[PDB]
Design a protein around this ligand. Structure first.
Ligand SMILES: [Mg+2]
Ligand SMILES: [Mg+2]
Ligand SMILES: [Zn+2]
Ligand SMILES: [Zn+2]
Ligand SMILES: [Zn+2]
Ligand SMILES: [Zn+2]
Lengths: 444, 444
């Protein structure tokens, strides 16, 4: 259960590359607790499998380095995230963001594209709903559109993840359409869920007007304001928020769509590791100092949420790891993994002081990127990068001849710290997480 | 710390896909022991990363299934296996078989191709050599040529893994070349190391004659006999062996090159998941019934080795997982993963019963195979398979245009059971494995 896992010294010498400073038995034994958790923070790196973690550590911290956030959770395991074929109910080996998020939030498998509904299109309550009912405070933060699959899975039960607002719902999720007597689009269901703290992008869908119900005619933003939501749109206004509760829940919309990525780098190309020079990522000029960082949103959320005596449940998502992986952009992808590590550090720092918080870091599924030899002549897209060690690392995306690289179905790392964190050890299924969180918090 | 990790029931229903029957905390806590291990069995799946484990499980046991051997080890973690660039001394992100094996059996990082020597081309003692010095019984078994990087790393100190016998050594490893002061070729050093049990392939190099020393002029096979080794070449004679020790060391050579693979299936092709029907693996008709299986050799070895009162150290290798991954042959690859699982089961059974045996299952490095969506249009080699679920799973190899798919650098799974197994948890380095084993046996 050590906190420092960096190489001991000279990696070229006997024992210089070791990460362990001694025997873990006693320490590891001491970190095993079945006492109930008072709080839970689930950090999700979208599409951040072991490959993505390795590539970003190698680049930002060096091969023998270690992420003070992502690599510091003591209890580790691997878990499966296969989805279901809607027709046959047989496993679909490669899941999408929707079905995977639904699994840990509701504890039941589903088909690719569904949010909060099972194979029968039947709704099941999510962990955030159950927590909110027990009286715990709830948060939902992400760097993607708040209507994106991952954050949406905690507050919406819809049949197609594309049903963002009234427009898409009427024609893609007729049965959820508010007019048809349904629960409504993702956005409207998010407004109904009323989590104490909700922060992310996706401001554009709030410009749509409800077709039915009490706030018919008004845009979703107006409905938000009318219902008591405090709205903030930048780092500054977010910083000034001093309270977030059921009487005045917080809703931050920092981008029309997804929030900008931190690093800028060119897209990987065919024979790019041979024909193009090694790259060194630089900061993204399109990102303003007004758009909050994940670490800032996480920090603010934790402070506002920790005021609730009963406890809180918070989910944080580094959304664009997946997105930049689809786009075959190593810098964008690595910058976002680093961005999430800072968020995990904020969470771990709170967890350690408080002493009753279960922190979990994992991904919804694996992705395309592979770390390959400098001289690889690959069929897909590749790029050479200048890492922190002062050495070149080549990354490869070779599973799609299309504009978008794809998810992969490999089991991946799940790590945790705190009460009940032992239930993450060994082989488990993504659905076990739901039950692990429910039992730690003592939910019924 | 449970033994059954299969999905509980109906994966389409709430909680039907769970692998956990309850809370692991107490069980896990109980499986944490710092008592010294009397024996160690290290099973290595060459190139068996998390993706490889997942594909094989999907195919052979179904997505919700579980490997009775590979998935039954309770303590899990992820470890790094980067090598060193020979010139700069800086990390080389994608290791080879030789450099990786050298790290766990020696405790020092090295460059690609080196066997048992650091970057300064200096020899370091291996855990097998140290075990044998403490009076423990030693075993080395593998399905590849005994001269291959994985088994050789335990008995040879050579500057290039290509120095199989006298010929290649003279030309590629002149400094190790027997006929000028070196300890000899891989085969000559293996013959000098004299482990109690050595089983595998590579009988072809034993046909070479030493160029100097006492047995100059005789084939290496003749030298083996002159030195007291019992030579067995098929299952029946292997099964007939009664004892193996320093007076009568067992040397089993079951093939000229590598042992034949268990299953047969076609090679993945360009758009193979689209232009060709799904495939169903079949037993390899060429595999002679007289050639032992990895589990049979593992089983026989444990039997002979456990006769030493002091204990034993045993390394077992499912070598062709890697070779078939290079060749882009899913059936070949999965068959060898299944093969290794049976070996693991044999190991776990002895371990559970004896109660002072540390079992570790891991891989030397990650590989190329990826599990992708059935409709994937990939730039590399794909193939569709009919899984145990009656569902189609697609595999992809897209990191090389050469005739050999490549290793990848992602951190991968390491799992253990027994005394000191807690040291495998969290993030560690491949070199930490050396120290964990050295400490487990008290082999300082
Ligand atoms: Mg997402
Ligand atoms: Mg090998
Ligand atoms: Zn995703
Ligand atoms: Zn995606
Ligand atoms: Zn290997
Ligand atoms: Zn290989």
């Amino acid at each position: 259960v050590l906190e420092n896992r960096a190489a001991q010294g000279n990696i070229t010498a006997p024992g210089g590359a070791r990460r362990l400073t001694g025997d873990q038995t006693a320490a590891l034994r001491n970190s095993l607790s079945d006492k109930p958790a008072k709080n839970i923070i689930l950090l999700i790196g979208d599409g951040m499998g072991d490959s993505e973690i390795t590539a970003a550590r190698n680049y930002a911290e060096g091969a023998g380095g270690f992420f003070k956030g992502i690599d510091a959770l003591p209890l580790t395991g691997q878990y499966t995230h296969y989805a279901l074929n809607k027709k046959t109910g047989k496993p679909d080996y490669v899941t999408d963001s929707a079905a995977s998020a639904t699994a840990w939030s509701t504890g039941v498998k589903t088909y690719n594209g569904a949010l909060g509904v099972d194979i029968h299109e039947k709704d099941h309550p999510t962990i955030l709903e159950m927590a909110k009912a027990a009286g715990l405070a709830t948060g939902n933060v992400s760097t993607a559109e708040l209507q994106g699959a991952t954050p949406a899975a905690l507050v919406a039960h819809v049949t197609s993840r594309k049903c963002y607002g009234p427009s898409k719902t009427s024609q893609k999720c007729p049965g959820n359409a508010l007019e048809k007597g349904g629960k409504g689009s993702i956005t409207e269901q998010l407004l109904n869920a009323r989590a104490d703290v909700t922060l992310g992008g996706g401001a554009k869908t709030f410009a749509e007007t409800a077709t039915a119900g009490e706030w018919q005619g008004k845009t979703l933003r107006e409905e938000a304001e009318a219902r008591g939501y405090q709205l903030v749109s930048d780092a500054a206004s977010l910083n000034s928020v001093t309270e977030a509760n059921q009487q005045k829940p917080l809703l931050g919309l920092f981008a029309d769509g997804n929030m900008p990525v931190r690093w800028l780098g060119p897209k990987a190309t065919y024979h790019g590791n041979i024909d193009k020079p090694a790259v060194t990522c630089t900061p993204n000029p399109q990102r303003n100092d007004s758009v909050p960082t994940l670490a800032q949103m996480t920090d603010k959320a934790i402070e506002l949420l920790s005021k609730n005596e009963k406890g809180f449940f918070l989910q944080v998502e580094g959304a664009s790891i997946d997105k930049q992986n689809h786009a075959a952009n190593p810098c964008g992808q690595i910058g976002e993994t680093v961005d999430l590590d800072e968020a995990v550090q904020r969470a771990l720092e709170f967890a350690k002081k408080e002493g009753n918080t279960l922190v979990i870091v994992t991904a919804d599924h694996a992705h395309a990127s592979q770390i390959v030899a400098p001289d690889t002549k690959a069929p897909g897209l590749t790029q050479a990068l200048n890492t922190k060690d002062g050495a070149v690392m080549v990354m490869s995306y070779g599973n799609s001849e299309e504009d978008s690289q794809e998810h992969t179905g490999s089991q991946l790392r799940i790590a945790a710290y705190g009460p009940h964190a032992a239930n993450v050890v060994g082989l488990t299924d993504q659905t076990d997480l739901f039950y692990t969180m429910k039992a730690a918090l003592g939910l019924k």
